[PDB]
Ligand binder design. Structure first.
Ligand SMILES: C[n+]1cn([C@@H]2O[C@H](COP(=O)(O)OP(=O)(O)OP(=O)(O)OC[C@H]3O[C@@H](n4cnc5c(=O)[nH]c(N)nc54)[C@H](O)[C@@H]3O)[C@@H](O)[C@H]2O)c2nc(N)[nH]c(=O)c21
Ligand SMILES: Nc1ncnc2c1ncn2[C@@H]1O[C@H](CSCC[C@H](N)C(=O)O)[C@@H](O)[C@H]1O
Length: 252
């Protein structure tokens, strides 16, 4: 593929995040786990338990095969359901709750976000972290004002002007080479997210852009760099990576 560097970067960034907030023996709840793309990362992190939840059953089964056919020291649990707009009660709490490239889907409606934020807080141990990587609304609107909304790797389209300005847009179309196709993405209303979480005991402890986060980490972990094979992305690839940001809330 022609997006390998972009996959390496994203996985790199995610691995570093996991390394930063997880510790040995931790219990992790992976929301929007997908096809278990982080099982290996967690295996290196030496975590003890892994629970993955995804709305799509086609991905869960893929995450099962992977878990089933891999050298892992942690117990896995998969469940296919809606963890954002449908009540969720798994029974136990977790030290770390991860939602990689998937939490923005919780912003479907006002109620959805609320349910989703409630589902996160009730499955998080006090002191526990909720790490995520979501698209940056600020970034996107700027590329919009610059007219540069795409390239050979991706494409984004906002909604129509009928009685609406930029700040009034709630969603957009995202297309990615060898990935989603005109997938409907919901903008992450940051302020509403913060307030909503703060109301449930979760505080904002980290918000950084993918590129900076990437550059900063790539310098502190040169080994994980060459290990995951990476270094110096083309500006064309940077645009795709630059769309996402890192956000972390902790249950004080
Ligand atoms: N979905 C996935 N990615 C990313 O693409 C990779 C696919 O490879 P993969 O899942 O096969 O990873 P491994 O080889 O197992 O990694 P491993 O070698 O175990 O480390 C994932 O791992 C995600 O990083 C996405 N990136 C963006 N921007 N947007 C998306 O919607 C998206
Ligand atoms: N309400 C919901 N509950 C759980 N997963 C959801 C969801 N809405 C969307 N998703 C999931 O969001 C995921 C986004 S992509 C998942 C990628 C994965 N975290 C990685 O790092 O590769 C998809 O697998 C999709 O099925």
């Amino acid at each position: 593929s022609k997006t390998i560097n972009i996959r390496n970067a994203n996985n790199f960034i995610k691995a570093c995040l996991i390394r930063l907030y997880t510790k040995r023996g931790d219990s992790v709840l992976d929301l929007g786990c997908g096809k278990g793309g982080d099982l290996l990362k967690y295996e290196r992190a030496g975590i003890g338990e892994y629970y993955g939840v995804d709305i799509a059953e086609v991905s869960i089964n893929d995450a099962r095969v992977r878990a089933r056919n891999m050298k892992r020291r942690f117990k896995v649990f998969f469940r296919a359901q809606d963890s954002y707009g449908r009540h969720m009660d798994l029974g136990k709490e977790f030290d770390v709750i991860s939602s990689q490239f998937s939490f923005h889907y919780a912003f479907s409606t006002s109620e959805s976000l609320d349910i989703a934020q409630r589902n996160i807080a009730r499955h998080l141990r006090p002191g526990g972290y909720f790490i995520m990587t979501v698209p940056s609304r600020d970034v996107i609107l700027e590329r919009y004002k610059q007219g540069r909304m795409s390239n050979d790797f991706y494409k984004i389209e906002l909604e129509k002007m009928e009685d609406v300005p930029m700040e009034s847009v709630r969603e957009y179309r995202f297309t990615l080479l060898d990935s989603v196709n005109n997938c409907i993405e919901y903008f992450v209303d940051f302020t509403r997210m913060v307030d909503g979480f703060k109301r449930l005991g979760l505080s904002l402890v980290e918000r950084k852009g993918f590129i900076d986060f990437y550059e900063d980490e790539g310098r502190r972990n040169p080994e994980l760099s060459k290990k995951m094979g990476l270094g110096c992305l083309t500006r064309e690839e940077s645009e795709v990576v630059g769309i996402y940001e890192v956000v972390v809330f902790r249950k004080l």
